[PDB]
Design a protein around this ligand. Structure first.
Ligand code: CLA
Ligand code: CLA
Ligand code: CLA
Ligand code: CLA
Ligand code: CLA
Ligand code: CLA
Ligand code: CLA
Ligand code: CLA
Ligand code: CLA
Ligand SMILES: CCCCCCCCCCCCCCCC(=O)OC[C@H](COP(=O)(O)OC[C@@H](O)CO)OC(=O)CCCCCCCCCCCCCCC
Lengths: 61, 118, 54, 39, 80, 165, 738, 144
C-alpha cells in the first residue's frame, strides 16, 4: 500500500486519530488484516502513539 | 490457619460456652427457648421501668415498664419466627426453630411476669 | 436460587444483598425484563398508568 | 547565564512577571485615577 | 458472569494475559497478525471485571472488552 | 429620566449618602491630633470621597430611589440620552483588549506549531517571538477580518470528531 | 566508630537542570505531551524515593531540603520582627497594654482598602494582630523598636546562613550514608545540645534579662526609663537591688547552697495578679530544671567510648511470651526508612502541638495574654489545627512505609507482623466501639432535641433532668486543686486557676476562673472521643490494609497512591491507603471543628467576660444550651455570627469578605468531590473541537484531572473553605466582643 | 503432560495463623488449594497478611478465592522463579485442576487450545442496541 514515511489520514471512526494525519512506519506484506503501521506525534488517552490499520482505513493525504 | 488465642481457645471459656443453653446438644428446643426467654425478659424488664416515660409517676412505672417489655418480647418472638421461616426451606430446622420461638415467647412473658412480682 | 425478583433471573441468581436493591430499582423498567415482548410492554404500561390514576 | 535566562523563560516565572506587570499597571492606574466608574 | 470478547485487531502482544489477576485469558494459535497469536477467554466464569486487560491492551481501540453482566460469588470477588 | 430615574446631581438620597460617609469619616477623625499621620490619612480619604461624589455627579449618572448610580445598557437609548460612556465605550474597549490577547495567543500557537518541538515552546516561552507578536498585535481587528475573508481563519473538516460525528 | 563522613563535590552548581523541567524523573524528563505532565511534575517533585533507589542520595536531598525549610522560617521570623518594629504600635502598647490593640500590619491607601486600618489605639491605624507576638516580646524584655529591628536583621542573616548551609551540604560537602545512620549520636547531640543547651541558654536569658525588665514593667516605671539589659549584665549591684541573691554571685551555686537563689527561682504557681501571666521566676526555674534534665538525658547512648546504651540491645531485650520476638527488627526499620521516622515524628509532633494548645490556654505563660481573648482563641485554634494535620500526615507516611519499605524477610514473626496478622480483629473491634460511641454520644443530642421539641424538657439529658455528671473529671479537678496542701508542699498555689479557687482579673477583664464541668461537658467530651476514634479507625485501617485485603490480595503491587482496581468485584473505588488519608482528612476536619467550637463557646460562656460580679460574654448559656443540636445552631453559630455579618463598612469588613469567600471555596470543592473525570474529559473533547475549529488547539493536549488529583483538589478546597470560614467567624466575633 | 492430582498430606509452610484465613465459604461452597515444590527454605509474603517460611520440597496452602492464589502464584513465579499450580476443592471432596489447565502457562502460545469468546470483527462493526431489543434478556450488541 502506502510507502514508508508518507503521510496518511485515518478513516477508522472509533480511533483516537480519526480524521488526523500520521506517518507510515511499515506495511506488512503477509495476509495480516491490519498491516499499515502509523505513528502519530500526539498520544491517545492510553499514552500510545502507534496503531495498526487496514488499507481502506488510510488515505495518503 | 485460625489465630490461636487464649480467649478463643481457653478451656474454662469453652466449658462455660458449652454450659449455656444455646449449646447443650440434646435438650429440647422448647426448653432452650424457655430458658433463654426467662433470662432475657427478666433482664429486659429493668430499663423500661427505671428510664421509661412513666418512670416518675408512682404505682404505674413498673406496670408500663413490664407491659412495654412484654411487647418487645412479642416483637422478638415474631423476629425469631420470620427468621426461621426465611432460613430453613434439632434446633436448626423449621419445626425446631418454630418450637424454639414459641418457647422464647412463653419464657420471655414468664420472665417479665416474674420480674413484675419481684 | 431465589424467587425475587421474578423479572430477572440474572438478579435472582445473585447470592448477595445486591439482589434486593436491584430488584427494587429495576421493577418498572419493563423493556429489560425476562421474555418481554412489545405487546406485553404496552399492556403493562397501560395498566401501570391506571394504577397511577387510582 | 543562557540556562538562567532559559529558566526565566519558563511558564510560572513568566506568568509571575507578567501578572506582576499587569497588576502593577492596574494599581498605578487606580492610584493616579482614583475610582473610575464611567468614560 | 461477565462478558469478555476478543476482537480481530489483536496483535498478540500477550499484555492482557499477563495483566489478569484471575487467569481467564490465554493465547491461541492464529494467522491474522504477524505474531501468530490471538487472545481468547475460555474461563469467563471466574472473571471479576477489574478491566486490567483493557488497560494493558495497546491497540486503538481496545481488542479486549469487559461487559459487566450478572454477578455471582466468583465475579464479586467474595472470599465469604 | 430613563425608567423614572432622577439624575444624581438632582437626587437627594445621593447627597444624604455623601453626608453620611463624611459624617462617619469625621467621627473617626475627631479622636486624633491635628497634624498626625492618621489625621492626614483620614483627610485624604475625605478629599477622595468628595472628589468621587463630585465626579459621579459631574458625569451625568442616573440615581434611583436609594441614591446609587445606575447604568444603562442599550446602545440607542444611551447614545440618545448621553450615557454612552458607561457600557458602550467600555464594551468596545473590552472587545479591543480581549481580541488583542486572543489574537496574540493564536499567532504564538501558529508560530510554534511549525517547529520540531511545539510542546517545548509551549512550556518554555520564546520571549523574543512573544514580544514581537505582542507588539504586532495592535492591528488585530484588521488582520482578523482579513483572515476571515480569505478562509484561513477556520480549519476545514479535518477536525477530530466522534464516530457519530 | 562514630565519625564525620563526607563526599567531596557530588553535584556541580549549575543552571543547566533549572532549564530542564522534570530532570529528576526518567518519565518526566521526556517532556510534556499532555497536560497531566505538569501536575505530575509538581506532585512528584519532592518524592525522593521515586527519584533514586540509593538511600544515601535520598538522605542528602532531605538534609538540604530541611535546611531550605529552616531558611524560609528564618525569613518569616525576620519579617515578623521587622514588621513589629517598623509598622506597629508596640511601644505605645507597652505603655498601655489593657487599652491598646496589638497591631503590626498596615495597608496602603488604594481602592478603599484603607478602611481596614482601624482605630487600634496608640495613635496608630492598622490591622489588629492576634498572633501574640507583642506579649512574647514584652515577656522577653524587649522595650524598643530598635531591638526588634536588630532581631530582624539577625534572623535574615541566619536565613542566608541556612540557605548557604543547604547549598553547601548538597553541592560541596554532602554527608555520607553512615553519617546519617548514627542515630545514637544524633539522639545524644539533640537531647543534650538542642533541648538541653536551648533551655539552658534561654533560662540564662530569662534570669539575666527577662526577670528584671518585667519586674520593673510590673512595678510601673516607664519602659524608656528602665535600664537596658547590658547594664543589667554589667552592673550586678542593680541585680542585687531587685533580688539580693545576686549580691552573693555564683558562690551559692558551686557550694550547693541553692536555697539562697529562691528570690528568682520560685515555685509560686498561679498567675501574676497584676499581669495575668505565669511568674517568670517560675518559668526560669522551670527552664533550668528542664535544661539539667535534658543534659542528663543526652548522655545515654554509646558513641566512641564504652559507656552508654545501645538502641538495638534495648529493643532486642524486651521480649515476652505473648509477643514472641518482640521488638527485634525495629532498629533496622527505623534506621533505613525515612517514612517510618516521619510517621513517628509527625504523630508525636502533632500530639505535642495539641498539648501546647491546651497547656497554653489553661496556664497563660505570657503577660497580658489571658485578657487578649482574640489571641487566646487564635493560638488554641491554630495549634489544634496544625496538630490534627500532622497526625493525618503520620498515618499517611506510616502507610507509605507499609507499601514501599516493609520487607518481611527481615521482619518475620515480629510486633509489626502480629499486628498485620490480627488486623481484622483490630479493625472490627475499632469499628464496633466507633458505632457504640456514635450511637450513645450523638443519640443523647438527638434524644434531647426530640424531648425539647415535644415539650418534655424533664425527659432530657441535662443538669436539671436526667443528669450525667463527669464524676471522674470533677474528682481529678478537685484533687489537683487540693494538691498544694498535701502532695505538693512547696507549692504556694495550684498550677492553674481552672482547677478551682479564686479569680485573677486584669484591667476589668477575667484572665482565668475555675471551669465547672457538667452534663454538657460530658456530652462534648464523648463526642470528641467518638470523632477521634473514627479518625483513628480510617487511618489505622489504611495502614493495616495498605498491602493486602480480602478484596485486593495484591494491593501492594498497585502502589500507595492509585485510583482503584476497576469496577469489578462490585467496585473498588478508594481502596488505596492514600484514599484512607483523604477520608481521614475530612474526619479530622470534623473532629477539630467540634473541638474548637467547644473551646470557643465554653470560654465565652463560663470563663471570659468583664468584672464589675462577673458578667460573661454570653451570660453563661453553655450549661443549658449545649445539650441540643438546635442549641448549638442558634446560640453559637447563629448568635455569634452577628459580628461577622455586620462587619461591613468597618475595619472588620475583610472578615466578612473572607467569610463569603470561604463559603464559596467550600462549595467549590463539592464539584471535584462529587463528580468524576470521564464527564470532564468528554466536555474537554467538545471544547478542544471548538479550539481546533479556530486553529487554537494547544500542542500540549488538554486532559481532565486524574481521579486522585480530583480527590486531592476536592479535599484541599474543602479544608481551605471550612477552616477559613471558622477563621473569619472566630476572629470577627472575638475582636468585636473582646 | 498429564493432569496432576492433589496430595492432601503435603506439608504446609511455617505460619503462625492469621485472621485473614478461611471462612464459611470453605465449608459450604469451595476453597482453593495451591501447591508448589521449593528449592530452598525462604520467607515469602502471605497474600492474606503476614510472613511465612516455605519448606524445602512440596508445600500446601489453602485460600478463599482465586485472586489470592493468583497473587501467590505471581509472587512465587516472578520473585523466586518457581512453577506452582492451584486447584479447586469442593466440600464433597471434588478436586478441579486449573492453572495451568493446558499445562503450559497461558502467557505463551501452545498448540491444541481452542479460541473461545472471539469476535472476528472490529469493535466499530458492532450493531446498534435497536437491533437486539426484545430478546429473552438484556443483551449488549457485542453478544452476537
Ligand atoms: C442512643 C442514645 C440514646 C439513649 C441512651 C436514650 C435513652 C433513653 N431514651 Mg431516647 N431517643 C434516642 C436516643 C437515645 N435515647 C433517639 C436518637 C431518639 C429519636 C429517634 C429517641 C427518642 C425517644 C423517645 C420518644 C423516648 C425516649 C426515651 C428514652 C429513655 C428510655 C428508653 C427505654 O426505655 O429503652 C429501653 C432500654 C433498653 C432496651 C436498654 C438496652 C441497652 C442495654 C442496657 C445494653 C446492654 C449491653 C450490656 C452492657 C452488655 C453486657 C454483655 C454481657 C451480658 C455478656 C432513655 C433515657 C423515653 C423517655 O421517656 O425518655 C426519658 C421516650 O419516651 N427516646
Ligand atoms: C412521567 C412518567 C415517567 C415514567 C412512566 C418513567 C419510567 C421510567 N423511568 Mg423515568 N423519569 C421521570 C419520569 C418517568 N419515568 C422523572 C420525573 C425523572 C426525574 C427524577 C425520571 C428520571 C429517570 C432516570 C435517571 C431513569 C429513569 C428510568 C425509568 C424506567 C425505570 C424506572 C425504574 O424501574 O426505577 C424504579 C424507581 C425507584 C426504585 C425510585 C427510588 C426512589 C427515588 C430515588 C426517590 C427517593 C426519594 C424518597 C421517596 C423520599 C422519601 C423521604 C422520606 C423522609 C419520606 C421507566 C421506563 C431509568 C431507566 O430508564 O434506565 C435505563 C433510569 O435510569 N427515569
Ligand atoms: C467581572 C466583573 C467586574 C467588572 C465589570 C468590574 C469593573 C470595575 N471594577 Mg471591579 N471587582 C471585581 C469584578 C468586576 N469589576 C471583582 C471580582 C473584585 C474583587 C477582586 C472587584 C473589586 C474592585 C475594587 C476594589 C475596585 C474595582 C473597580 C472597578 C472599576 C475599574 C475601572 C478601571 O479599572 O479603570 C480603567 C482601567 C484601565 C484604563 C485599564 C485598561 C487598559 C487598556 C489599555 C485601556 C483601553 C481602553 C480603550 C470597573 C468599573 C474600582 C472602582 O473604583 O469601581 C468603581 C475599584 O476601586 N473592582
Ligand atoms: C439585545 C437586544 C436589545 C433590546 C431588547 C433592545 C431594546 C430597545 N432598543 Mg436597542 N439596540 C440594540 C439591542 C437591544 N435593544 C443593539 C444591538 C443596537 C445596535 C444595532 C441597538 C440600537 C438601538 C437604537 C438606535 C434604538 C434602540 C431602541 C430600543 C428601545 C425600543 C426599540 C423598539 O421599540 O423596537 C423593538 C426592539 C427590537 C426590535 C430589539 C432590537 C433593537 C434594534 C436593534 C433597534 C430598534 C430601534 C427602533 C426601531 C427605534 C424605535 C424608535 C422609538 C422612538 C420608538 C428598546 C428598549 C430605540 C430607543 O432608543 O427607544 C427609546 C432606538 O432609537 N436600540
Ligand atoms: C543558588 C545556586 C544553586 C544552583 C545553580 C543549584 C542547582 C541545582 N540544584 Mg541545588 N541547592 C541550592 C543552590 C543551588 N542549586 C540551595 C540554596 C539548596 C538548599 C535548598 C540546594 C539543595 C539542593 C537539593 C536537595 C537538590 C538540589 C538540586 C540541584 C540541581 C537541579 C535542581 C533544579 O534544577 O531545580 C531548581 C528548583 C527551583 C528553581 C525551585 C526552588 C524551590 C525553592 C527552594 C523553594 C522556596 C520557594 C518559596 C517557598 C516561595 C513560595 C511562595 C508561594 C507561591 C508558596 C541543580 C544543579 C537537585 C539535584 O541535584 O538532583 C539530582 C537536588 O535534589 N539542590
Ligand atoms: C516572610 C513573610 C513576609 C510577608 C507575608 C510580608 C508582607 C508584607 N510586607 Mg514585609 N518584609 C519581610 C517579610 C514579609 N513581609 C521581610 C523579611 C522584610 C525585610 C526585607 C520585609 C520588609 C518590608 C518593607 C520595607 C515593607 C514591607 C511591606 C509588606 C506588605 C506589602 C508587600 C508588598 O506589596 O511588596 C511589594 C510587591 C512586590 C515587590 C512584588 C514583586 C514580586 C516579584 C516580581 C516576584 C518575582 C518572582 C521571583 C522569581 C521570586 C522573587 C525573588 C526575590 C529575590 C525578589 C505585606 C503585608 C510594605 C508595607 O508593610 O507597607 C506598609 C513595606 O513597605 N515588608
Ligand atoms: C549538639 C549539636 C547539635 C544541634 C544543636 C543540632 C540541631 C539540629 N539538627 Mg542535628 N545533628 C547533630 C548535632 C546537632 N544538631 C549530629 C551530631 C548529627 C549526626 C548524627 C546530626 C544529624 C542531623 C540530621 C540528619 C538533621 C539534623 C537536624 C537538626 C535541626 C532540627 C530542626 C530544629 O527543630 O531545630 C531548631 C532550629 C534551630 C535551633 C536553629 C539554630 C541552628 C543553629 C545552626 C545552631 C545549631 C548548631 C549546629 C549543629 C552547629 C553547626 C555548626 C556548623 C557551622 C558546622 C536542629 C537545628 C535536621 C535539620 O533540620 O537539618 C537542617 C536534620 O534533618 N541533625
Ligand atoms: C546558660 C546561659 C548563661 C550565661 C551565658 C550566663 C552568664 C553570666 N552569668 Mg548567669 N546564670 C545562669 C545562666 C547563664 N549565665 C543560670 C541558669 C543561673 C541560675 C543558677 C545563673 C545565675 C547567675 C548569678 C547569681 C550570677 C550570674 C552571673 C553571670 C555573668 C558572669 C558569670 C561568670 O563569671 O562566668 C565565668 C566567666 C566566663 C565563663 C568567661 C567567658 C569566657 C570568655 C568570654 C572567653 C574569652 C576568650 C577570648 C580568647 C578572649 C577575647 C579575645 C578577643 C577580644 C580578641 C555572665 C554574664 C553573675 C552576674 O554578673 O550577674 C549579673 C552573677 O552574679 N549568673
Ligand atoms: C451527618 C452526616 C453523617 C452521618 C449521620 C454519618 C454517619 C456515619 N458515618 Mg459518615 N461521613 C460523612 C457524614 C456522616 N456520616 C461524610 C460527609 C463523609 C465523607 C467525608 C463520611 C465518610 C465516612 C467514613 C470514612 C466513615 C464514616 C462512618 C460513619 C458511621 C459511624 C459509625 C457510627 O457512629 O454509627 C452510629 C450511627 C449514627 C451516629 C447515625 C445516626 C443514628 C441516629 C441518631 C440513631 C439511630 C436510630 C434511628 C433514629 C432509628 C430510625 C428508625 C426508622 C428507620 C423507622 C456513621 C453511620 C464510619 C464507619 O462506618 O465506621 C464505623 C467511617 O469509617 N463516614
Ligand atoms: C488494657 C490493655 C492491656 C494491654 C496489655 O496489657 O498488653 C500486654 C501483653 C503482654 O506483652 P508481653 O509481656 O509479651 O510484652 C513483651 C514486649 O513485646 C513488650 O515489652 O501484650 C499483649 O498481649 C498485646 C495484646 C493486646 C490485647 C488487646 C488489648 C486492647 C485494649 C483496647 C482498649 C483500650 C482502652 C483504654 C485506652 C486508653
Amino acid at each position: 500500500g502506502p510507502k514508508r514515511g508518507s503521510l496518511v489520514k485515518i478513516l477508522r471512526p472509533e480511533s483516537y486519530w480519526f480524521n488526523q494525519v500520521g506517518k507510515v512506519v511499515s506495511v506488512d506484506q503477509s495476509g495480516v488484516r491490519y498491516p499499515v503501521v502509523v505513528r502519530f506525534e500526539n498520544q491517545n488517552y492510553a499514552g500510545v502513539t502507534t496503531n495498526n490499520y487496514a488499507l481502506d482505513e488510510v488515505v495518503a493525504a | 490457619g485460625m489465630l490461636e488465642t487464649p480467649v478463643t481457645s481457653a478451656p474454662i471459656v469453652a466449658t462455660y460456652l458449652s454450659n449455656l443453653p444455646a449449646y447443650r446438644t440434646g435438650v429440647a428446643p422448647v426448653l432452650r427457648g424457655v430458658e433463654i426467654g426467662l433470662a432475657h425478659g427478666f433482664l429486659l424488664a429493668g430499663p423500661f421501668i427505671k428510664l421509661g416515660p412513666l418512670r416518675n409517676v408512682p404505682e404505674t412505672a413498673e406496670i408500663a415498664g413490664s407491659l412495654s417489655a412484654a411487647g418487645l418480647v412479642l416483637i422478638l418472638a415474631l423476629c425469631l419466627s420470620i427468621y426461621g421461616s426465611a432460613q430453613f426451606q434439632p434446633l436448626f430446622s423449621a419445626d425446631g426453630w418454630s418450637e424454639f420461638a414459641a418457647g422464647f415467647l412463653v419464657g420471655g412473658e414468664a420472665g417479665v411476669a416474674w420480674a413484675y412480682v419481684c | 436460587h431465589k424467587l425475587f425478583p421474578k423479572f430477572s433471573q440474572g438478579l435472582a441468581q445473585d447470592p448477595t444483598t445486591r439482589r434486593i436493591w436491584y430488584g427494587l430499582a429495576m421493577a418498572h423498567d419493563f423493556e429489560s425484563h425476562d421474555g418481554m415482548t412489545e405487546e406485553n410492554l404496552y399492556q403493562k404500561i397501560f395498566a401501570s398508568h391506571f394504577g397511577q390514576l387510582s | 547565564m543562557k540556562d538562567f535566562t532559559t529558566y526565566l523563560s519558563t511558564a510560572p516565572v513568566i506568568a509571575t512577571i507578567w501578572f506582576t506587570f499587569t497588576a502593577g499597571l492596574l494599581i498605578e492606574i487606580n492610584r493616579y485615577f482614583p475610582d473610575p466608574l464611567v468614560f | 458472569a461477565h462478558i469478555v470478547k476478543i476482537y480481530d485487531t489483536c496483535i498478540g502482544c500477550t499484555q492482557c494475559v499477563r495483566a489478569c489477576p484471575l487467569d481467564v485469558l490465554e493465547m491461541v494459535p492464529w494467522d491474522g497478525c504477524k505474531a501468530s497469536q490471538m487472545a481468547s477467554a475460555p474461563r469467563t466464569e471466574d472473571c471479576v471485571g477489574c478491566k486490567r486487560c483493557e488497560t494493558a491492551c495497546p491497540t486503538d481501540f481496545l481488542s479486549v472488552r469487559v461487559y459487566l453482566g450478572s454477578e455471582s460469588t466468583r465475579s464479586m470477588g467474595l472470599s465469604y | 429620566d430613563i425608567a423614572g430615574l432622577t439624575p444624581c446631581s438632582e437626587s437627594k438620597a445621593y447627597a444624604k449618602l455623601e453626608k453620611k460617609e463624611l459624617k462617619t469619616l469625621e467621627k473617626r477623625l475627631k479622636q486624633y491630633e491635628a497634624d498626625s499621620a492618621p489625621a492626614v490619612a483620614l483627610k485624604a480619604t475625605m478629599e477622595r470621597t468628595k472628589a468621587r461624589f463630585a465626579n459621579y455627579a459631574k458625569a451625568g449618572l442616573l440615581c434611583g430611589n436609594d441614591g446609587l448610580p445606575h447604568l444603562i445598557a442599550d446602545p440607542g437609548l444611551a447614545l440618545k440620552y448621553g450615557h454612552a460612556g458607561e457600557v458602550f465605550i467600555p464594551t468596545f474597549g473590552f472587545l479591543y483588549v480581549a481580541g488583542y490577547i486572543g489574537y496574540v495567543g493564536r499567532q504564538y500557537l501558529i508560530a510554534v506549531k511549525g517547529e520540531a518541538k511545539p510542546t517545548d515552546k509551549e512550556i518554555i516561552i520564546d520571549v523574543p517571538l512573544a514580544t514581537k507578536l505582542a507588539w504586532q498585535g495592535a492591528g488585530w481587528p484588521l488582520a482578523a477580518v482579513q483572515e476571515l475573508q480569505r478562509g484561513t481563519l477556520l480549519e476545514k473538516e479535518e477536525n477530530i470528531t466522534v464516530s457519530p460525528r | 566508630k562514630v565519625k564525620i563522613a563526607v563526599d567531596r563535590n557530588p553535584v556541580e552548581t549549575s543552571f543547566e537542570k533549572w532549564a530542564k523541567p522534570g530532570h529528576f524523573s526518567r518519565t518526566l524528563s521526556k517532556g510534556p505531551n499532555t497536560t497531566t505532565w505538569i501536575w505530575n511534575l509538581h506532585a512528584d517533585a519532592h518524592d525522593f524515593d521515586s527519584h533514586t533507589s540509593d538511600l544515601e542520595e535520598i538522605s542528602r536531598k532531605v538534609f538540604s531540603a530541611h535546611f531550605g525549610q529552616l531558611g524560609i522560617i528564618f525569613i518569616w521570623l525576620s519579617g515578623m520582627y521587622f514588621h513589629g518594629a517598623r509598622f506597629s504600635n508596640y511601644e505605645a502598647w507597652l505603655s498601655d497594654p489593657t487599652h491598646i490593640k496589638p497591631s503590626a500590619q498596615v495597608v496602603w491607601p488604594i481602592v478603599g482598602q484603607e478602611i481596614l486600618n482601624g482605630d487600634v489605639g496608640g495613635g496608630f491605624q492598622g490591622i489588629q494582630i492576634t498572633s501574640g507576638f507583642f506579649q512574647l516580646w514584652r515577656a522577653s524584655g524587649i522595650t524598643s523598636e530598635l531591638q526588634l529591628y536588630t532581631t530582624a536583621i539577625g534572623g535574615l542573616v541566619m536565613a542566608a546562613a541556612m540557605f548557604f548551609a543547604g547549598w553547601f551540604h548538597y553541592h560541596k560537602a554532602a554527608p555520607k550514608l553512615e553519617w546519617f545512620q548514627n542515630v545514637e549520636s544524633m539522639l545524644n547531640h539533640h537531647l543534650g545540645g538542642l533541648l538541653g543547651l536551648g533551655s539552658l541558654a534561654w533560662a540564662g536569658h530569662q534570669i539575666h534579662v527577662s526577670l528584671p525588665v518585667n519586674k520593673l514593667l510590673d512595678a510601673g516605671v516607664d519602659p524608656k526609663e528602665i535600664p537596658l539589659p547590658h547594664d543589667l549584665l554589667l552592673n550586678r549591684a542593680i541585680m542585687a537591688d531587685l533580688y539580693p541573691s545576686f549580691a552573693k554571685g555564683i558562690a551559692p551555686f558551686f557550694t550547693l547552697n541553692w536555697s539562697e537563689y529562691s528570690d528568682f527561682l520560685t515555685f509560686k504557681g498561679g498567675l501574676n495578679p497584676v499581669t495575668g501571666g505565669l511568674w517568670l521566676s517560675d518559668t526560669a526555674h522551670h527552664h533550668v530544671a528542664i535544661a539539667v534534665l535534658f543534659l542528663v538525658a543526652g548522655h545515654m547512648y554509646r558513641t566512641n567510648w564504652g559507656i552508654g546504651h545501645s538502641m538495638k540491645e534495648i529493643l532486642e531485650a524486651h521480649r515476652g511470651p505473648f509477643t514472641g520476638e518482640g521488638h527485634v527488627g525495629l532498629y533496622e526499620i527505623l534506621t533505613t526508612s525515612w517514612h517510618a521516622q516521619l510517621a513517628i515524628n509527625l504523630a508525636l509532633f502533632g500530639s505535642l502541638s495539641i498539648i501546647v494548645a491546651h497547656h497554653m490556654y489553661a496556664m497563660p505563660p505570657y503577660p497580658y495574654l489571658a485578657t487578649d481573648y482574640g489571641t487566646q482563641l487564635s493560638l488554641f485554634t491554630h495549634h489544634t489545627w496544625i496538630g490534627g494535620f500532622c497526625i493525618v500526615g503520620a498515618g499517611a507516611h506510616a502507610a507509605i512505609f507499609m507499601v514501599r519499605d516493609y520487607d518481611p524477610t527481615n521482619n518475620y514473626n515480629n510486633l509489626l507482623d502480629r499486628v498485620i496478622r490480627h488486623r481484622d480483629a483490630i479493625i472490627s473491634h475499632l469499628n464496633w466501639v466507633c458505632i457504640f460511641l456514635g450511637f450513645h454520644s450523638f443519640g443523647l443530642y438527638i434524644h434531647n432535641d426530640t424531648m425539647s421539641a415535644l415539650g418534655r424538657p424533664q425527659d432530657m439529658f441535662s443538669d436539671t433532668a436526667i443528669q450525667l455528671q463527669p464524676v471522674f473529671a470533677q474528682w481529678i479537678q478537685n484533687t489537683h486543686f487540693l494538691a498544694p496542701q498535701l502532695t505538693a508542699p512547696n507549692a504556694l498555689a495550684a498550677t492553674s486557676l481552672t482547677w478551682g479557687g479564686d479569680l485573677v482579673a486584669v484591667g476589668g477583664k477575667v484572665a482565668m476562673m475555675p471551669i465547672s464541668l457538667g452534663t454538657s461537658d460530658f456530652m462534648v467530651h464523648h463526642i470528641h472521643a467518638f470523632t477521634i476514634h473514627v479518625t483513628v479507625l480510617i487511618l489505622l485501617k489504611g495502614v493495616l490494609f495498605a498491602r493486602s485485603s480480602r478484596l485486593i490480595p495484591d494491593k501492594a503491587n498497585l502502589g500507595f497512591r492509585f485510583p482503584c482496581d476497576g469496577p469489578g468485584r462490585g467496585g473498588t473505588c478508594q481502596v488505596s491507603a492514600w484514599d484512607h488519608v483523604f477520608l481521614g482528612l475530612f474526619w479530622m476536619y470534623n473532629s477539630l471543628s467540634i473541638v474548637i467550637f467547644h473551646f470557643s463557646w465554653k470560654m465565652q460562656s463560663d470563663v471570659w467576660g468583664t468584672v464589675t460580679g462577673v458578667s460573661h460574654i454570653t451570660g453563661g448559656n453553655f450549661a443549658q444550651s449545649a445539650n441540643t443540636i438546635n442549641g448549638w445552631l442558634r446560640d453559637f453559630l447563629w448568635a455569634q455570627s452577628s459580628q461577622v455579618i455586620q462587619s461591613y463598612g468597618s475595619a472588620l469588613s475583610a472578615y466578612g469578605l473572607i467569610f463569603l469567600g470561604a463559603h464559596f471555596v467550600w462549595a467549590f470543592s463539592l464539584m471535584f468531590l462529587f463528580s468524576g473525570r470521564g464527564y470532564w474529559q468528554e466536555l474537554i473533547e467538545s471544547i478542544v473541537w471548538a479550539h481546533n475549529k479556530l486553529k487554537v488547539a494547544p500542542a500540549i493536549q488538554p486532559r481532565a484531572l486524574s481521579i486522585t488529583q480530583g480527590r486531592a483538589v476536592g479535599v484541599a478546597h474543602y479544608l481551605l473553605g471550612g477552616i477559613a470560614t471558622t477563621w473569619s467567624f472566630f476572629l470577627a466575633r472575638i475582636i468585636s466582643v473582646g | 503432560w498429564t493432569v496432576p492430582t492433589l496430595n492432601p498430606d503435603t506439608p504446609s509452610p511455617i505460619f503462625g495463623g492469621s485472621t485473614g484465613g478461611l471462612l464459611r465459604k470453605a465449608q459450604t461452597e469451595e476453597f482453593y488449594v495451591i501447591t508448589w515444590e521449593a528449592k530452598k527454605e525462604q520467607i515469602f509474603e502471605m497474600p492474606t497478611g503476614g510472613a511465612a517460611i516455605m519448606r524445602q520440597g512440596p508445600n500446601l496452602l489453602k485460600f478463599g478465592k482465586k485472586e489470592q492464589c493468583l497473587a501467590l502464584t505471581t509472587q512465587l513465579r516472578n520473585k523466586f522463579k518457581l512453577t506452582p499450580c492451584f486447584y479447586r476443592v469442593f466440600p464433597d471432596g471434588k478436586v478441579q485442576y486449573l492453572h495451568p489447565a493446558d499445562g503450559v502457562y497461558p502467557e505463551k502460545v501452545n498448540a491444541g487450545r481452542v479460541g473461545a469468546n472471539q469476535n472476528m470483527r472490529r469493535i466499530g462493526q458492532n450493531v446498534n442496541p435497536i437491533k437486539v431489543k426484545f430478546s429473552g434478556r438484556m443483551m449488549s450488541p457485542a453478544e452476537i
